[PDB]
Scaffold this active site. Sequence first.
Site, short mmCIF file in Angstrom:
data_model
loop_
_atom_site.label_atom_id
_atom_site.label_comp_id
_atom_site.label_asym_id
_atom_site.label_seq_id
_atom_site.Cartn_x
_atom_site.Cartn_y
_atom_site.Cartn_z
CE1 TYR A 148 0.87 0.87 4.40
CE2 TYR A 148 0.63 -1.56 4.13
CZ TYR A 148 1.06 -0.29 4.97
OH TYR A 148 1.76 -0.49 6.14
CG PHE B 216 0.46 8.48 6.70
CD1 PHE B 216 0.19 7.04 6.98
CD2 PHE B 216 -0.58 9.21 6.09
CE1 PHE B 216 -1.23 6.41 6.74
CE2 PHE B 216 -1.99 8.48 5.66
CZ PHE B 216 -2.05 7.26 6.24
CG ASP B 217 2.61 2.66 6.45
OD1 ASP B 217 3.78 2.59 6.23
OD2 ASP B 217 1.86 2.32 7.25
CB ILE C 42 -7.41 1.09 10.77
CG1 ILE C 42 -6.72 1.10 9.32
CG2 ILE C 42 -6.37 1.88 11.81
CD1 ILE C 42 -6.14 2.26 8.79
CE1 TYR D 99 -4.01 3.86 13.28
CE2 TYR D 99 -3.31 4.88 11.23
CZ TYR D 99 -3.25 3.73 12.32
OH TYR D 99 -2.49 2.88 11.81
CG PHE E 2 -4.56 3.30 3.26
CD1 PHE E 2 -3.22 3.13 3.59
CD2 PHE E 2 -5.23 4.02 3.89
CE1 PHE E 2 -2.62 3.46 4.90
CE2 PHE E 2 -4.98 4.32 5.31
CZ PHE E 2 -3.52 4.18 5.70
#
Lengths: 567, 48, 107, 325, 92, 378
Positions: free
Chosen positions: C26, C36-37, C56, C82, C99
């Site tokens: 992802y 962020f990821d 999540i 979140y 995502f």
Amino acid sequence: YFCDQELQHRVESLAAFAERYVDKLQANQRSRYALLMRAFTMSAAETARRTREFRSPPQEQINMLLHFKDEADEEDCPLPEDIRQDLQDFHQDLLAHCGIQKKPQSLQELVSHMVVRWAQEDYVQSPELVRAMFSLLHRQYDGLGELLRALPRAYTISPSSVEDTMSLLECLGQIRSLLIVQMGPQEENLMIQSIGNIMNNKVFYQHPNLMRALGMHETVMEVMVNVLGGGETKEIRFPKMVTSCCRFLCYFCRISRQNQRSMFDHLSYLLENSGIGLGMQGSTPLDVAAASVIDNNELALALQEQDLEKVVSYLAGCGLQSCPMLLAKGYPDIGWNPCGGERYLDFLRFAVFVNGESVEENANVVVRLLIRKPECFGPALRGEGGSGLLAAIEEAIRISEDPARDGPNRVHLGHAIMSFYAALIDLLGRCAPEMHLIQAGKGEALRIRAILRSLVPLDDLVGIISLPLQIPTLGKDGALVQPKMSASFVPDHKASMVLFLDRVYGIENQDFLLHVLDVGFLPDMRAAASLDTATFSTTEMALALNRYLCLAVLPLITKCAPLFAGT
Amino acid sequence: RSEGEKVRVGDDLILVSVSSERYLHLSTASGELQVDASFMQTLWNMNP
Amino acid sequence: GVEIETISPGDGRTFPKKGQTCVVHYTGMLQNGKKFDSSRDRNKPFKFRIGKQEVIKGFEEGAAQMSLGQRAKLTCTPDVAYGATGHPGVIPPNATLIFDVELLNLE
Amino acid sequence: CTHARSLWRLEPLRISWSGSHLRWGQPLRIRHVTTGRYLALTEDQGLVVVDACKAHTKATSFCFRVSKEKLEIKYGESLCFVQHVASGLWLTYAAPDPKALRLGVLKKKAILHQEGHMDDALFLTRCQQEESQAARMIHSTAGLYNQFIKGLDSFSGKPRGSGPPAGPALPIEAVILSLQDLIGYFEPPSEELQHEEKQSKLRSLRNRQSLFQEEGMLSLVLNCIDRLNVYTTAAHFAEYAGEEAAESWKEIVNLLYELLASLIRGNRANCALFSTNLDWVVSKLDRLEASSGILEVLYCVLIESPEVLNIIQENHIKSIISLLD
Amino acid sequence: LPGPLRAGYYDLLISIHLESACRSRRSMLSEYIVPLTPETRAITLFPPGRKGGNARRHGLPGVGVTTSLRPPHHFSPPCFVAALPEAPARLS
Amino acid sequence: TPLYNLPTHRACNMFLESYKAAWILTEDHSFEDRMIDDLSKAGEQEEEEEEVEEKKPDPLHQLVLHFSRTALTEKSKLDEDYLYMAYADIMAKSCHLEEGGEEEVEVSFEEKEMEKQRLLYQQSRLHTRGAAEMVLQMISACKGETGAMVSSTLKLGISILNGGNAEVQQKMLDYLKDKKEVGFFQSIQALMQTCSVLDLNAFERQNKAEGLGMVNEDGTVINRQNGEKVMADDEFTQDLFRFLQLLCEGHNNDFQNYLRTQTGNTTTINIIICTVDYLLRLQESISDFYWYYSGKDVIEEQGKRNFSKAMSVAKQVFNSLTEYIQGPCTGNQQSLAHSRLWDAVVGFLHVFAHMMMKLAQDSSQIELLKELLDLQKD
């Protein structure tokens, strides 16, 4: 790093030879024992070998076995010449590895030529560079010394315990990493968890030598220093942290006497950091000091007069001012904190009484400091007031009686006063000189005994022995009205009373013997006989009365049984 | 002053009994000044 | 409220179970455009099995909702993922998450 | 002892014997160097320090007699019994007060009693030239800064209104020159110096900084900064004070911040003093005037104090981030 | 890459990935505890070359078998899409 | 009690302990002189720096300068530094080899002079590089705190000053007068105050512990050897007074007068008076020890060792005083005449008379009597 790896290889090889050589020497010593048992004809040799090789501590006999390195002492050892030569050959190998004995061939020569080459090249300016370069030079030139310093940290662990050893190492790493972290809630909780895991680990009590070799007793002492730096200012911070640190350290002292020695080595800091507001409840620096001093006689002799002076100063402070925590709670102002006074009195008790005996030097120093500072004795024994111990005890009883003055886990000021007086009198009684000293008639012994005799009167002591005690009786509706624990008068007070009585005024005449019998002893017998029935036998105060009986007053009766003749 | 030093004339002294380990003391709490060896000090400036 | 968007079609045939592992690569991404990821530039085929709430729930529902080999955009609500500074520093408070999810294998 | 309060200047009553060696029994005035007052007598206590206006020969004249006997002086290794020349009373220590005994330090009050004690003799000890000079600048700087504070308070709360804000104008040139001189005086030692010389000058700087801080010059500088920062801008300071006064308000503010940074430079105690004033520096961070100065003050406090770092809060951190944004 | 930026990125990698484990291993390296294992009894002072040149020949430092008990390095994957959960302290 | 029944790991631990105690520790390796010589070799830096007068320091000089800079660092206390302990020990023994000599055949004049010159050269290898300045700086920096750091510093200073040599004495005097600091002498005074004397309470406590005895967790040790509370830091105080004696040796009246009064400095501490005070305390303690043992018929071996240690310390103090007054140093002579030395002397004379009588009565104390006569000779 490369030299650290080389040193690690050296100590690992030393452990390998340790395994091999203890195997060979154990087999040889077992065969020697069998041969000695077989040979009954050699009486002198058999007696000498049985006394030295087979009636000595294991470290002593292994020292005797390994003593053949000296050329003169080549006959005292019983080891075979092949085994001697094996250990000698390993010694030469170790010297060759350490370098004892153009282009460098080994790390030692490489580092030496490297350091000399740089330092001859230039006047280097970086102080860290200078320090690292010369430390490398010193380690390269002192290979034997580095191993000599590293071997105290060296330890051999049984292969079956390796999992728990790794777990203990991980907990140690967690505490060491949290050392540099400033204290907080999560860090405190993690330290609680790590200390609990270390305590529950079986290696903690299995190997005290490895325990000291890792030496995180100093680490949790550093935890003490770090938390108490903020704790001393204003109020204590993280009391759970303080309690768990003594949990670990105090249990560590209880594990072994060598651990007790290592903790006693740092006694001065604990007593200086111990305060009433700091250790107002729980596991305290006073507790770890008491653990490091209790049940041990060499450490009691090694106790410092400066430490005794400090704890007497704290006792004087407790006698002088009331408890600020109690004032914050709202209980009536007493003018002195009996809880802190009793805690320091208990520490002095453990300091002056060890192994069922009274230590003369510590007893004399403590009574000397006590009479230098009369405020330590409390309001009852003050010279000007003359309140009297018995009258003060009755005042404490009425203080516990009236709820308004007894009110603002729970703090009961009346019982606190009684416990303070009981602890002080107990300390004096165990500071009394031994009966051997009294019979020998030593001037200092009779002098300290006379000082205590002047300090405490006979009439107050017999009065508190004869002091009536309430009894748990079943109510009209069936509710067992038992006295409140730690709020009413307890038999431990009378236990310390009669301990002082038989240690200072050892009963030698039948008139006063039967007088105290009719005063306090026989009424206690009636009360216990009445409580014997199972309706009230399960009550805790009756069980404590039985404890008082069997531990304090019954032995006095056994001692005074010959004096009971002709009655 | 310190212990081990020779006592000066007119210097205050603390006379302590060796038997009772009590200091010579001037008690005035009774209303009349009296001498008694007790557990608090009194500066006896004994002079020759 | 995870929003499905079909960036690239996949099998359209094999869909995750509760109790099936999915290896996903992802690209976590914020609403404003700040990732962020990045599991792909970290070379992480992140293994997670659907229905165990380790992930999540918006992202997990989107992964189960997508099929193997189908590249899709998940617009996860801050409630569904979140809510209040999940991994503080990584994720701002009350921000929608995007995502870019594909199923490498459905194991 | 290290405090400048212990320093006492000895000005003889006769100017001719000012440099001549001191005489036993010579009339002379004892003066406090830091405060500028003169030790003298009064009808309401035994002896106090009074102003130079009240310092008359009937009060300030003291003489060091040899002993209590009825009718040269060595600097140390000797003993001197002070007695006021006219009254004849001797400088003795008061009996130990019970409140002072309860207090940690004895701090015996000096009293003039004709029936003196046996420990009224003194050990006169000269302080170094550095300490004497430091005390003298402390006195002069305190005087100038008090004049500045009084002027600022005089026109504070009353607008100028095309009229003189106050009679006595501010000593602005004197304040600016004193600020620059103090910055040069607390200038840190240069790194180009050798190791031992640099450390010795660092030690001298640390003890001078400690002297000024314990005397309270740092607090007075902070008070002056408060008085100046009451006004938002030079336009506002010209609205209240004069325009010629507001001409250099920026310069005075910047020099005050630089002096505060120099005072708190490299001193653990001086930076720990700002643990209470963390709110002060943080609230003044966003000020346009001397923004670099207040940022440097905060930097010095944070690098030389761990307690302030212990008591930094989230609003302080948000303000520091507001400096960035 | 410029010098300051290169040093910053290098030490940033070291700090965020290797610093905690490096510090823990560095603190644990002081003590030398070793179990009784076949590896331990195979450890020898000198390499067993059984040759004239191999006699009194020091081996390469740091290349031998180490049996000293060292707590294993603990690392956690830096994933910020799994739901984030008292909570135990995270790993490097 | 057997050893074969012991677990293998415990036997391994005890084998490591015994091997450490009786093989590694007993083995002696001499690397100090060789390593100091290798460090003192300048190499080729002087060969390439022939044209430059201000040559770069040799490695030993750089080491000395680094230690001096860490001394001169403004710190609250002088923290422990195992590197400095090791290096100070190495340098001290490197210049102490020739001092130690490295029925009996007499030494010729040439042999004595050769030994003296080799000692001087070994001391030059350090004091031409800053060793004297280093030891003065660290003695000042210890702030009068007794410890292994100041112990090693005093050992290195003694090894430098051995023979009472004028070059190191002059260098130390010049450094002290140039810096005009009181730290050195106030540290010396504080160390003198923190020195110890005979403690009879400690003696009785040690005897009671010895009679008591104990056991150990690993194996067993009955009557475990512990630190001698009586005559603690006796080596340290002997080294301190030996260092002062070496400072004043050679009748160097400049340093003698500097020790008497520190001219130029703001505060003067009279080390001679400090020595008098410590000798007075030692005299009182030895007198108390005599009053303790006088009732006893025969001195026990513990008491004999305590007497020997305290009396060797007394010998060192007497030698320090004799080196203070040797030569026509009228100021030192007057100060010792007028500061309580006669009282300490009367105490020592009383002790000498009564110990002489008792140790003549007792035959087995010939060694103690000889040491007593030697101290009386001093």
